[PDB]
């Protein structure tokens, strides 16, 4: 039973995520959606493709996703987290993924509350605490793709989510999404707007632009991509410098046993300790 | 032969390598070693020491006494003079140094030094300590180390400050000289440890100076090494067994006793593998330095969902943080090993010291009932095989396994026969893994034995959740499903308890009416103590638990039957191992030998503990030796 | 009189307030109530239900059967028809609705509904359920609720959609009508709950319609309320006792069973206080919504260092996260209460259901040995006094106290005599607090009883650290200090065990050869069950543990002595309360009544459990009733 | 024994903190230094005034400090944290203090390592992970005073620390500090430089400036104050709106017992639950 309230917002994200996976032609079997605790958390349980779901602890999705991805980089790993979930209980993990730049897309369901009390993205007043700009945190954390979407413009979202999965690195999509129980615009429509970094010397300029666009909010509320830089080695690129065949023979793929006997040789390890 | 050497010095004077050089030379001569390192939570300046026990036979424990104490500063003398039995090597420059001038010494130790001297009316100088030693038949051998460092600098035409660290090798040279073994083995162990040609030659001269300045007192003869021998610490041997067990993902957060294991894995992460059709292939272990322990546990658990054999390593503070993630692994029946380097606790505790005070926490970690398989290694060879066993247990019962290794074993090292870790085959048991027949797979099938067939992410559509769930993995509150699923996960522990022989879960040595009940690191000191006690007509047996869950309850009933003394020997205040025996069988220990100072139990502590109990029924013997 | 009513409906149809209105009216008539709310982890659409047990005498437990089931949808009928014994109130619009059309129902419940109907060859419609009920003497009373909502809208000249929620009050009106109590009390309870004049009048008409459509069947008479009576839930009463105990700082992270307590404290945070010279003064409790549980625990512990009585509240996942911070409080001998709302576990578990599966974890939380004082409230009045007791324990023994309250008591409510929580004085015991005589104060003086004199931050220079420390609070690795300090903290638990009467740590009711051994929420169902069993000549006694640490070990030995049956009754799979008895005394329970579905044990479950054990020595009776 | 290596850096911070407390004339008895795990962690243990020390868990200082301060706001509460400590294990707590704006000063000992492995402020290469700009994180988190100091210019540090304690709100000083075992400039010397927000309309401009200055690093490395805004209500200001006499009768000050009998009246609480 799809048990969210009528009105929600979460229906639009589900719909747009589903469409992103389909139109990419990614084999769904190889898609793991890793989601947090909250009403946002239920999501993969309600999809209509043979994707896999990992419904994790509150704020801990990114850490699970990390293990999954690094162990089997041929899986396509997507994190869906509520705003109480990431940003609240998971802020540290949220920042650190940014420094690693692992090939993962993270989707934050910004409803403004703990649906299932005030969340980290509720403005002061209206609540004793201030709100945080997820996009500015993500930028300073080192995320190599930062975007804002909006849950009602489904067709735009679908395409954000697509560019976010194709991004070679860590991607955030902060998604605006009303909670019924507890004017916008698009950077695709701006003639200047090139958020893509295409050579290294260009990087600071684009970063500085993203971070200032990300603060704009005087009901001239942008959406789309704020920053994108594929020149940053991924975490998987750095693993490959230490483990030459990581891509061809990653941990999930290796044969560790034949007829119940270890295939792993430690003779040289032991030899190095001889008297 | 059992000869105990100690060297000491300020942290960062590279004295720990001095000690590995001394050990390396003795070992090359044919002697087994057991060695320990004691250090403060501190990078430079505090007092560290290094006990090395030498024997023609394999050696299993440390002693409360030192035969030969090697020293080049005032503080090492003050910290170990009461333990010194045959020879002191010391620096005559400090003879008039008083306890109060040693700034790096904790005031609690200074008070205790003064107490021990005052007790027999001596003052507080090194000179006073020399008289204290002379009252006990100890021979003191003094060096003007300044004058020797001079002579070396003269030779290598350098200023004294380049060669100052060679004080270390003068002490080692003289110590080794007392033994009577031939200089070549000390010279080779020097050449082999340092890289730079120049370090080699001035350190060699320094050992030579020490060695030629003393008589051959122990007259030790060389022995032939028939079978290949290895020198290894607990960390390293844990890594060796996991890698042998097919580990290919480890996440960790730095914490003293366990960082070493993950750094060793990472330095050697590209492994030779002999694969199908007998092809050499390389395979890489992914090692991730997590930002905290909550991430470390959760990265490991996620990794395992892909079919990788995953693990993490940590210590007490970090283990506490992992509790939630272990509970999630329990609920979702995730194979994962947590190597628990148990250190001095609570809180930050004694970061560089050891303890056995977290056993019950480990047995009950996190919320809910689910199988937590718990083993604890009793010595270095166990660590190797227990590491492989842990990984197999985790995949056979699809649940977290906690492998306890006390800090004391992690930082101790020993020399033993290589074949102890190569003779038996390295068996990998992957449990109930299956090929999914279609697109959607029920990960949580209710079976009679508790264990659901498992497939890996990628192979078919599967669902995991932290909520209670049905067989498909979807959130389910239904009472009857709940009754069934929750039982099913717990029934695995019953299956484990039927399938694992109880004999594999304990080591029983001897047959007697006095039982030494223990687990973990005291194994060694007890086995050595039993032999000495035997020779004075005191018959004892050791019962050493390896697997606390599932607990070997019938075997423990059968064994502890009509025993008149059951002496629990543990490194904690509550005798937590005896508490679990009592919960599972109703059998209560009669007496206790207990140590909670953070320093290992010694052979002699156990002998004297057992005699105190036999000769006056002392209920609790509380130990406290070691600086 | 013991009459059980249930109402049910989709979450967010405000049916839970329907149930509080029904209860409020009955109570005003002189009847005691015990009420429970069952809900899914879900905001709207899932099936919730509300059992209210009515009696002229104080009532302590829920029942497995319902006398009167009130309903206005198809799903409530399907979920509770097998428990319905005397009357169904239902909506004739759904008579041809089949199980398969109820989309919000878990497929596991639909299967079980069909199973129960198939079992006696009925189909799967509401009509079929009505025949199932008629086969058992149940009288069914059908309403065209549509036509009644029409008639109301007609009257208030509104469209049906404004008044649609009045289905609830038609059901409540008719239920209350069956009882035979006078309408005024239902009308007053309406007026008093809603604010808006207009809601009041159409809901009143709806109750009237229901009430006048049924006969007076139970013929209940009014009773006079001699002593003031109150209606309260577990959360609220925990808050009341803490505030009474002098709580002035609470930090929390939202989590279902415990958020309510902190929100209630915060809505009433400005407290009247009668201070020196008898002045009224206001004092504010600081409540902080932490960003996670690690912060929540640590804010509380820091607060307490200032001398404030501090606490946090949480549930299983959150408790697991707090482990490290509890270990720090232990090491630094910080008073702090953790209210542990124990819910269905492991991991996220059953966020809205209950459990007793985290007792041993609670007793061993976090690394190291240090006193963890653990109590568990067995009913609503205990929660009040246990909350004050917890706070006093924390300051007397300077250490964390865990106050277990099961979810089941938090969301249950009861009507009882106010004087049960006002008659005895509210005693505040602050322990070994002293005025520092100078600028620098030793926070950790070694005394014989373990308890060091304490001063607050601000009053003098003091030091706390997570590392082992001397009497001044400075980092100390010294072996002898370590031996002394570590013992000193643990000796407090020995002091506690000497100073606290063992009689305060258990409630013993009866004297018999059959012992019902329990702790926590099953207390009520067992006491009710004992009376019924007594009347069929089955003599039993209850032994209910309140304080698991220090455990009342001598009193439990004395009491459980020569008893032939010891039946552990708990809401877990391993009978963790019986496991602690066995660890402390060697006494093993002979049999078990066990429930791990997340729903409370009922009176009748215990009666039938005890008879199953007496009449066939069933070893483990496993319970599973409740939707 | 002051047991840090010769060379350290931690000696300069100790010295400058000590001088800040002295020259403010704050009664030292009322000063609590709350410090993390690491060599940085030992600090209050080695001071020469009657200040109090709370040596906490790794990454958890800010949370302890919060409890302490809110329970007794007349204490002067200073947090000293290593870079592995805050920023690594404590990132979430680090961000949330920013949203609360509690009157606390936080001092980060940026040595670049886990002294007592690579830390969160070690640059990529030279280490598999990227570094984070503590100052940019602090700005996006909502810290109302953000500064960089340098451990060798002791006299400048001393005064940063002073302005950071006097700041009415949450203050960060990121302190640069070399670790021997494992050109700069000053915004006081810049003629434009006014980081103080003095009316509300000024706030975005100053924020935007701070955040871009905070990225400047082409060996033209600034130090001093980047941002300061005392117009943001403190957490204690917001408590006072709910608890009118919080400042005069805060939790640590209230008399909760006379001759062992509660002074707290719950009669009205109980009355509200009557039948
Ligand atoms: C460690 C832990 N702490 C707290 C909870 C309780 N909890 C569950 S859902 C929830 C609301 C989560 O809010 P958010 O992440 O904003 O998700 P939403 O419901 O708004 O999608 C809370 C507080 C839990 N399950 N685990
Ligand atoms: C919860 C927890 N995890 C890990 C540790 C182990 N630990 C102690 S000090 C240390 C180094 C800390 O580095 P940093 O915070 O950078 O401080 P520094 O020594 O560089 O001042 C580590 C990893 C601990 N005590 N507690
Ligand atoms: S609560 Fe708010 S978020 Fe959770 S479901 Fe109902 S609407 Fe969507
Ligand atoms: S290790 Fe690095 S930081 Fe810790 S003390 Fe020695 S130098 Fe200072
Ligand atoms: Mg949310
Ligand atoms: Mg640091």
Swiss-Prot record, chains A, D:
This is 2-oxoacid:ferredoxin oxidoreductase 2, subunit beta. Its cofactor is [4Fe-4S] cluster; thiamine diphosphate; Mg(2+). InterPro entries: 2-oxoacid:Fd_oxidored_beta (IPR053399), 2-oxoacid:Fd_oxidoreductase (IPR051457), OFOB (IPR011896), PFO_beta_C (IPR032686), THDP-binding (IPR029061), TPP_enzyme_TPP-bd (IPR011766). [4Fe-4S] cluster binds at residues 5, 8, 39, 179. Heterodimer composed of an alpha and a beta subunit. One of its GO terms (molecular function) is 2-oxobutyrate synthase activity. Keywords: 4Fe-4S, Iron, Iron-sulfur, Magnesium, Metal-binding, Oxidoreductase, Thiamine pyrophosphate. The keyword Magnesium applies. It catalyses: a 2-oxocarboxylate + 2 oxidized [2Fe-2S]-[ferredoxin] + CoA = an acyl-CoA + 2 reduced [2Fe-2S]-[ferredoxin] + CO2 + H(+). Thiamine diphosphate binds at residues 37-40, 58, 84-85, 115-116. Mg(2+) binds at residues 83, 111, 113. It comes from the Archaea. Catalyzes the coenzyme A-dependent oxidative decarboxylation of different 2-oxoacids such as 2-oxoglutarate, pyruvate and 2-oxobutyrate to form their CoA derivatives. It comes from Sulfurisphaera tokodaii (strain DSM 16993 / JCM 10545 / NBRC 100140 / 7). Gene3D superfamilies: 3.40.50.970. Its EC number is 1.2.7.11. Binds 1 [4Fe-4S] cluster per subunit.
From Swiss-Prot, chains B, C:
It comes from the Archaea. Its EC number is 1.2.7.11. Substrate binds at residues 256, 343. The Tyr-Pro-Ile-Thr-Pro (YPITP) motif is important for the turnover of the reaction, presumably through its flexibility and mobility. Catalyzes the coenzyme A-dependent oxidative decarboxylation of different 2-oxoacids such as 2-oxoglutarate, pyruvate and 2-oxobutyrate to form their CoA derivatives. Heterodimer composed of an alpha and a beta subunit. This is 2-oxoacid:ferredoxin oxidoreductase 2, subunit alpha.
